[PDB]
């Protein structure tokens, strides 16, 4: 898999969005249905969905 990585800290607005730290990690779920990913923290365990131009792959 290619995990990926926040550049930005990030606050929820919504029900189904995240609240993450900058370096945190996650698995993507699915983001074949626009720029918002459906992401699972390796930090929290939550999945939901994150603005994908706030993180990068992982090397």
């Given amino acids: ?3 990926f990585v926040a550049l930005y800290d990030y606050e929820a607005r919504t029900e189904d969005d995240l609240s993450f730290h900058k ?3 996650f698995q993507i779920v699915n983001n074949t249905e626009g720029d ?3 992401a699972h923290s390796l930090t929290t365990g939550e999945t939901g969905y994150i603005p994908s ?3 990068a792959p992982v090397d």
């Fill in 1 to 3: 898999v290619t995990l």
């Fill in 23 to 25: 370096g945190e990690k």
């Fill in 36 to 38: 918002w990913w459906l």
């Fill in 53 to 55: 131009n706030y993180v």
